[PDB]
Symmetry: C5
Subunit: 205 residues, 5 copies
């Protein structure tokens, strides 16, 4: 643990924290969802509650090290408070997200960071027709709140939401779940804006 202590000291106690990306030093954030449960549907308010894990990955030059200078350490876990993290937000939530997992990230020697917060989210969704064979489709966009595509580019590894951990005895069965990168422009501004649209079709089980 001596080497890791030195590593963290060198990484976090020497320079100011990473100030976030800029147009001149943009960052790509890879986003992916593992949907565990549609927990609740409220047809009186058109809110639906999801529980999922949101995988986030990005890479910082300032987080790199040579494993040889640090006892061959190739990666470590550290509190998310010690590092910059992206401001990925649901655009149509109706309550603050509830955090279901410890806020800890994995940093590897090439400056890659992997952060996977489990969340419960209430978001805008009319569940009308969920009690049918065809089900109902709802959607929520995720993106940076303050950074445009010139500072944070989003990508997905795949358009298929990971369902391998979906609760088999949920009240709701998933018919399809996709996660799609979308680009848009606003007339005021030349910079593109990026989101990942989470689209879930589901019905009562």
């Amino acid at each position: 643990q001596a080497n890791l202590m030195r590593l963290k000291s060198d990484l976090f106690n020497r320079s100011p924290m990473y100030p976030g990306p800029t147009k001149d030093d943009p960052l790509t954030v890879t986003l992916g969802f593992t949907l565990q449960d549609i927990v609740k549907v409220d047809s009186s308010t058109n809110e639906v509650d999801l529980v999922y894990y949101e995988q986030q990955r990005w890479k910082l030059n300032s987080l790199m090290w040579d494993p040889n200078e640090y006892g061959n350490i190739t990666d470590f876990r550290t509190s998310a408070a010690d590092i910059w993290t992206p401001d990925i937000t649901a655009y149509s939530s109706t309550r603050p997200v509830q955090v279901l997992s410890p806020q800890i990230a994995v940093v590897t020697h090439d400056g890659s960071v992997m952060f996977i917060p489990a969340q419960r989210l209430s978001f805008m969704c009319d569940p009308t027709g969920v009690d049918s064979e065809e089900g109902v489709t709802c959607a929520v966009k995720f993106g940076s709140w303050v950074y445009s595509g010139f500072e944070i580019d989003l990508k997905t590894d795949t358009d298929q939401v990971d369902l391998s951990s979906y609760y088999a005895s949920s009240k709701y069965e998933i018919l399809s779940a996709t996660q799609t990168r979308q680009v848009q422009h606003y007339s005021c501004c030349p910079e593109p804006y990026i989101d990942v649209n989470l689209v879930v079709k589901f019905r009562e089980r």
Copy 2:
């Protein structure tokens, strides 16, 4: 990252933060609402729940910099905790406001700041008649809690609330939503608010 780290350090670590406006150095805050959803109505307590974005803009000389001294950086994003922000509050909420977005602001080299907190607000409103074609009208004022018109002047750019992102499948349809600056006098100095007036009905 180098130039930005220098900038933030120079801007934030060298002298005290802006201490807020005074009657002698007043500040103008521009407000604009984007109403997303009327999520719920409680006819038993006369509380209605809104989800909206609130755009806040102001400008401080203390946040100015010459981009040429900082690798041509012209703006940056930073935690709202690093800067002064105005204490704009709803005057008739019935619960603490729930924050729905990251508390991060955009600062521009001319001292301009743009901060856009997404919020869920429960406020006093009698939904009697919401189930009619004419619907119901409710209103909530927003303003500084502690600063008078002599220290913080409020304005809007338009009296139309932005509805272009209103949830099309909300339980409630919006008939009308305005955001209007008001000047009040109690019993010497003016007090300013922006009155959010929303008329709505069951969809």
Copy 3:
């Protein structure tokens, strides 16, 4: 802003914080309520929820300055966290108070402070009869939790609760609302008893 910055540095950075009152340096806190709304009544638990603004005032010698020395600044606003505030507490709440306003106070050059927290409070109240013409009366005492009357005295400006901002379309109309200093029982403790008589509109 330059002068206000110097003032706050001089007041807050260059001294140890006020450790609160004592028998030898007692403090008098003036309290006033502005009742905005009786939101909710729960007849199954005898709890009632109030929304109000609670005006608190007191004065500290350590918060004084000479306006001449600071560009004629006569008062300023500052976060409540920068200053000592009194531990005025409801004695019969049933849930932690919810704060509805910024925690910022106004400090004046004579050392006076004005702090007006807006709050939602659930407190012990039996609403049986609220749906009658007579209505019902409930009361809740506010006072320091740990300071006796030898350290914190309490007063009101007047026993009349401010109803000029009471929500016109509340489910509940106010038949009356008073705020009265009381002395209760080693040492005397002081409270202000908020007594509200109300009924369904």
Copy 4:
């Protein structure tokens, strides 16, 4: 305020805080409850909600001072964060306790500390029979969470819970309320068993 500022500096800014008791230097904590209200009964989940004040007392050598060296101050109020406090916990709560009073304690020159947290507690209790004349009995034990009786001994000044502040218009009438020290159970384990018998008013 100057002498008090000196005292607190001397008490809190010179040596590390009391590290808590050990088998060799045990500590006695006295507990008493003032039951304010049985607010809620949930017969679908067998949870009952109490509001009460819990008086806690203990004495530390490290909090002693000679009043003669500090302008004759004999006691002061200070944030509970400034001092060690015992980890007294209900053993059968079903929700985190909600704190209803400011986190401030009173320290006296002999090193005595008094801390009186007001709390709302949900705990395990089958209310069946509450709507009868016999009433129903529920109980919850309170004790240190991590300290055995070799480190913290608990004591009560009485086994009668203080009902002098019990809400007279509660939904529930108290038939009896006791607080009994119990020894279980290399070390001995000590708790105060709060036993309340009540019925619908």
Copy 5:
């Protein structure tokens, strides 16, 4: 107090905190549940609420001391904030866990730590059948969120959940309750809490 004050200053004020385990200095965490109550089931959302206390034990060289040098102190209690603690997490909770006990641990001179957080947990569970004679079985896995079995191995002292403190007047009777270490393929380790229950 003086000796313990010295001990804690020496332990916590000199070096950086233990930075957590790695493949080359892996750590073993022992878990055990004491189930107190099945408080609530929600058949509309398939959510069940448990109240339990979760024993966690592990051992750090960095927490060792010679009792001879510290007034024969063999152990002490200290805020969990003062020490590293494992990130043991329920894998199928539906609300943030609520902590019911002080966050304080016992550290022993051999570096051993014992931490026993009491928790209320809402987790994914279909109670259909709970009012039947056969009752219903639900399960929830616990483990490290971010460390594999290469960094944190999990163990139990028994596969029987402690029911000796189960609430006698719960709405639910416990028919069985087990806690079983599972390895899935770095190996990934969890403890599967499995509870069969029915309405009293």
